[PDB]
Amino acid sequence: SVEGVVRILLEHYYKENDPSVRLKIASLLGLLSKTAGFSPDCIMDDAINILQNEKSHQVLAQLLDTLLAIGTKLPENQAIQMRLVDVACKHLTDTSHGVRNKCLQLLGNLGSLEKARDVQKIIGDYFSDQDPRVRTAAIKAMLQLHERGLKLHQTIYNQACKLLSDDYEQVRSAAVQLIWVVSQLYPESIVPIPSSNEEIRLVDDAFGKICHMVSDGSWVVRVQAAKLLGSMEQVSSHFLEQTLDKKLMGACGAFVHGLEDEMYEVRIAAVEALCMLAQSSPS
Amino acid sequence: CVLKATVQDATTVDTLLASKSSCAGLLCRTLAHLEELQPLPQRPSPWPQASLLGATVTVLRLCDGSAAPASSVGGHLCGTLAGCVRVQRAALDFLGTLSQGTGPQELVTQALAVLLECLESPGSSPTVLKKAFQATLRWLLSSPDLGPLIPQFLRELFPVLQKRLCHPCWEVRDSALEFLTQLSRHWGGQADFRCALLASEVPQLALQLLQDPESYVRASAVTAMGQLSSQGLHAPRQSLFLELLHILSVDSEGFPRRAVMQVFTEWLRDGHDTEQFVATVLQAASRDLDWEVRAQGLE
Amino acid sequence: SAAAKQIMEETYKMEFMYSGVENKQVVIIHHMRLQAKALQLIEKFLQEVDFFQRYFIADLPHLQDSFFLHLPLPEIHKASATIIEPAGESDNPLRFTSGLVVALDVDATLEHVQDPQNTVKVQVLYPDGQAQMIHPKPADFRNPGPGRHRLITQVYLSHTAWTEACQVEVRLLLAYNSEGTIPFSKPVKVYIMPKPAR
Amino acid sequence: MKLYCLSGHPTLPCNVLKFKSTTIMLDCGLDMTSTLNFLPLPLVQSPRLSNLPGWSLKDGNAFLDKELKECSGHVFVDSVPEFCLPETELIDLSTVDVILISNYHCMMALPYITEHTGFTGTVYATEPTVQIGRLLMEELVNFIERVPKAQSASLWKNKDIQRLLPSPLKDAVEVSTWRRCYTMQEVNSALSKIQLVGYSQKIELFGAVQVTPLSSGYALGSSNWIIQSHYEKVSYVSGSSLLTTHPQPMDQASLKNSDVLVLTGLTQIPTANPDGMVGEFCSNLALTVRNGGNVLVPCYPSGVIYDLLECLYQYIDSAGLSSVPLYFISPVANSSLEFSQIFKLKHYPSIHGDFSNDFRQPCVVFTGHPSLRFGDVVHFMELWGKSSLNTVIFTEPDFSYLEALAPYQPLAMKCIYCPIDTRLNFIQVSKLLKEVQPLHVVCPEQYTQPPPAQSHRMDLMIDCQPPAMSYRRAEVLALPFKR
């Protein structure tokens, strides 16, 4: 008796005008959507009809949440996924931040793994959005997309590096994670330091950037970077040994600045990184 | 009027629902008047006693906070008079004025069944327990050996005379001892009352109070233990005489000395070695500096 | 009759207390368990052999002529427990008062145990006959190195009123769920001495 | 503007204030009376409770004879005490951006919220409240996990079977979201996210909202929040006291011009005089110490105890009680007394070790958690539960005392009940409302209707005009303001 009561409650939502009661009904729909063995795909069109004329904010948020929940339930029906991508890009421009969070999560979990719009660039445009929470969710969606198996492009590093000087907390950790993964993608590429005429491997740039990032005034990001340095093997050894010259005191001398930082947690993370990078290179 | 607002003209009930000041004032004035009238011979006829007592116990219990309203006026009244003093105090004064009123033991037990409740009621000021004890005494001393309910009520009461005897405010620590003394003077030859008392643990606390800091406590404690040990109700006589003479020889106040001399007068007058006793009290009451003590010594 | 129970316990020890068993060894030991249950029989047997058949659909072409069955010796370490602190040999007992707790610090190393956080318990025996089975918390199993683990924990000794100084038993146990307990450490007797309170 | 009220409890508040941009979480708390349906966690094997008659179902379709036990007319679940929790279904707990805090007695549920489900914000709290909160969470994690009893009980948890078990268990609510306690590393990492804030220290939020605490006089650092904007002002005042205790007395004048006064955390004993009940406490302690017997006074190792002790001190010199030690047994004693001092009683870390060499009877022993279900109080309540001389004296309104005392019946010790609640009572809150003149009021359903036990009274309902909108457990109210 799923579709019957669902249609009754939708006719209620149509006639009920109070947004709080509407959200109650929407939460009921979201909780009933998880019936294993039921076909709520018959109701996806109706959900799109609901979102095509909304005036509130949270309603679209949890509705696209249900749409993402059901899309994750049948990820093989690529037509449904393309329809979801379409309605999301339709709703991506919305002014509210929660709905944008939901659409970016939908794109991250339901992006096209084939190399027909460039969802990568559409999402990447949002590293310059106003509310930093939107940028946080954007980087999280980038991570989700990559971890599903899609190989990413080179430019993401060059766009993310700009966020390294931002004045917010989670954004910097997400940026360091993005640099880490994208450099694990394109390590050996040659990038020139714009401060001189020298050209070093992109892995070396990533390493030096993370080292300097460890010198941030926040400790969460320091833990994050100290840990993420742990598995960076292919970086050239001379840079590494330069990262312990205590005499040079941020791309170098990071380990010394860490192993005596205030909060012992970053110290421990630096110990782990030293252990790994020493197991890899005996000198 | 109130007893049409509980479970057994509107001019007065108007002011009864105006505020907490006006209602308390009206009820206090009415109880003050209605008790000022009782001891008079020109009293009306027939002087009601059932209705009066019923209304009074209802008012007292209501003020304690455990009545049972039966209408809007009863509800709002229980919600305005709850936890007052003036009403409760004057109500105890009336309900204790009702001793000259003759009648069966039914009324006596009706009134004790609320006074016992008003004694062991948490949230009861020290200016309430005193009048409560006075009223309980006048009630317990007017019941026509003893009766079928006296021991029951005493068993239910002494576990309240054992708590309010250690209240943390010396007013109660004195009123309780005074009430115990009134009993020990009115009920010294009733072996059933003595069963009730010795079975309780009152004297094992009075015997310890004589070291309380605040002087008046020591004074009333000495006079209580005096009017007690003239009966043979000692807690589990010399082991009190030594305590007395010690309080008399050195101490930091007057009241205990001038009260222990009164107690010694009581003993020597009643008949409770006598030469050496008078010597060891006189030769250590003379060199005392206060005047009341030397006066009572001459007495 | 008790020889069947001994078979069961030896199969239990070969299953759980050991490390590095392969599916072949599991087939063999479950076959021994089937033999043990069939022999202790002299209703549930049919359901249990059905369960055996369902979980062992692959070994059936390999258990030809079963109820001798070859046991391959794979490549292996027998786990054990070494109760150290305290020794208990000290004539100086542990003092306690007339009805109250008393703390006992157990400090014992384990070697080549398979994830001790779950399968280890401490058992306390009073000479009367009761048994306290204290499961130890997660964060009390320290990790000093490969194959070696350290267990430092607190055990609360008391009971109803005690008259004279006596002995109590504290030992280790390996708990398994196939529901059962295997004793694999030499027990330690601790001497407790009374002194009624002031 | 929206108000997702989660915790239906009346004095352990929690509610998600959803705003224009941010979604703040005013004072997520932890309902803790759920531990009353479960058996205790005694230190040593308790011979009376290990051999209780295993209660049996009338039909016996299942083997419930191992889960539920019967004692003197009440049947209990046998497990670890599975605490209650704020519903985690209405709003996803990741959208929350900032979690404020009022005072320690309401923060016991931060580990459940900001560690298990992916929370991304940063919580604010004054300094004394974060200290005492660390202390309380420490005693909890150290009490539940000293003799773990992880053997669970799951058959009873279904709705169908639940509807066939009598009271008190049929009275349980939302039995599907009950959890075992959290662990040490969890709370230690969770409290790291704290960012201390002083009084009147204006804090901004995304160029959109502004928050600021004010001293509230309930306890050290206890605070009433103010969450205002360019067009709206919400004045959270949760559990304030106007009786002038040690804390800096509240600022009842800053809350004017407000738009929504989410008033929560009022008294639970409306018909109880605090001063009189403290007098009763001292009275009973003296009555059962001056005859030989002991006394066992459960109380949290913070808060009202610092009130209580103080009075007891003023009682020690006004009744001559010099010859009776006064203990404090809890694994957070030292830091507790230090944080009471730097902002006769012989405190001890734990009943095992040093304490067993200072035991002189008679005595007085304040102890661990006051729901008579774990900590140390269980051990004494199994030691003194047989002598009609001894005495327990409850001084905590949180856990209803009847069922609490129940699973140690039949007991022959007295059990006084004199609760000390320094919180705002109803006449005072009526005066406070008429003074502050809030434009609206939001109070749990336990208030706008008179209490259940005393249905005839009509004066302990919070009287305010316009009528006070109320909320029920896990509801989503709309404060009817239009921009």
From Swiss-Prot, chain B:
Family as reported in the entry's similarity comment: Belongs to the BRAT1 family.
Renumbered ranges of HEAT repeats: 151-187, 200-232
Quaternary structure (record): Part of the multiprotein complex composed of BRAT1, WDR73, as well as integrator complex subunits INTS9 and INTS11. Interacts with BRCA1 and ATM. Interacts with MTOR and RPTOR. Interacts with NDFIP1. Interacts with SMC1A and PRKDC.
Protein name (Swiss-Prot/TrEMBL): Integrator complex assembly factor BRAT1
Annotated compartments: Nucleus; Cytoplasm
Gene name in the database record: BRAT1
Free-text function comment from the UniProt entry: Component of a multiprotein complex required for the assembly of the RNA endonuclease module of the integrator complex. Associates with INTS9 and INTS11 in the cytoplasm and blocks the active site of INTS11 to inhibit the endonuclease activity of INTS11 before formation of the full integrator complex. Following dissociation of WDR73 of the complex, BRAT1 facilitates the nuclear import of the INTS9-INTS11 heterodimer. In the nucleus, INTS4 is integrated to the INTS9-INTS11 heterodimer and BRAT1 is released from the mature RNA endonuclease module by inositol hexakisphosphate (InsP6).
Tissue expression as described in the entry: Ubiquitously expressed.
Posttranslational modification: Ubiquitinated by NEDD4, NEDD4L and ITCH; mono- and polyubiquitinated forms are detected.
Curated annotation (Swiss-Prot), chain C:
Disulfide bonds: none
Compartments where found: Nucleus; Cytoplasm
Subunit (UniProt): Component of the Integrator complex, composed of core subunits INTS1, INTS2, INTS3, INTS4, INTS5, INTS6, INTS7, INTS8, INTS9/RC74, INTS10, INTS11/CPSF3L, INTS12, INTS13, INTS14 and INTS15. The core complex associates with protein phosphatase 2A subunits PPP2CA and PPP2R1A, to form the Integrator-PP2A (INTAC) complex. INTS4 is part of the RNA endonuclease subcomplex, composed of INTS4, INTS9, INTS11 and inositol hexakisphosphate (InsP6). Interacts with BRAT1; interaction is required for the assembly of the RNA endonuclease subcomplex.
Family from the record: Belongs to the Integrator subunit 4 family.
The protein's role, per its UniProt record: Component of the integrator complex, a multiprotein complex that terminates RNA polymerase II (Pol II) transcription in the promoter-proximal region of genes.
Annotated protein name in UniProt: Integrator complex subunit 4
Species of the source: Homo sapiens
Gene that encodes the chain: INTS4
Full protein stretch here: 694 to 962 of 963
Swiss-Prot record, chain D:
GO cellular component: cytoplasm; cytosol; INTAC complex; integrator complex; nucleoplasm; nucleus
Location in or out of the cell: Nucleus; Cytoplasm
Recorded superkingdom: Eukaryota
Keyword Amino-acid biosynthesis: no
Cross-link (Glycyl lysine isopeptide (Lys-Gly) (interchain with G-Cter in SUMO2)): K58
Outcome when changing S283R: Decreased interaction with INTS11 and BRAT1
Principal cellular location given in the protein's record: nucleus
An example Gene Ontology biological process: regulation of transcription elongation by RNA polymerase II
Recorded consequence of changing S283M: Abolished interaction with BRAT1
Keywords: Cytoplasm, Isopeptide bond, Nucleus, Ubl conjugation
Amino acids binding 1D-myo-inositol hexakisphosphate: K2, F19, K482, R483
Subunit and partners: Component of the Integrator complex, composed of core subunits INTS1, INTS2, INTS3, INTS4, INTS5, INTS6, INTS7, INTS8, INTS9/RC74, INTS10, INTS11/CPSF3L, INTS12, INTS13, INTS14 and INTS15. The core complex associates with protein phosphatase 2A subunits PPP2CA and PPP2R1A, to form the Integrator-PP2A (INTAC) complex. INTS9 is part of the RNA endonuclease subcomplex, composed of INTS4, INTS9, INTS11 and inositol hexakisphosphate (InsP6). Interacts with WDR73; interaction is required for the assembly of the RNA endonuclease subcomplex in the cytoplasm.
Family the entry assigns: Belongs to the metallo-beta-lactamase superfamily. RNA-metabolizing metallo-beta-lactamase-like family. INTS9 subfamily.
Additional notes on this entry: Although strongly related to RNA-specific endonuclease proteins, it lacks the HXHXDH motif that binds zinc and participates in the catalytic center. Its function as endonuclease is therefore unsure.
Function noted in UniProt: Component of the integrator complex, a multiprotein complex that terminates RNA polymerase II (Pol II) transcription in the promoter-proximal region of genes.
Protein name: Integrator complex subunit 9
Source species of the chain: Homo sapiens (Human)
Gene from which this protein is expressed: INTS9
First and last residues shown, out of full length: 1 to 511 of 658
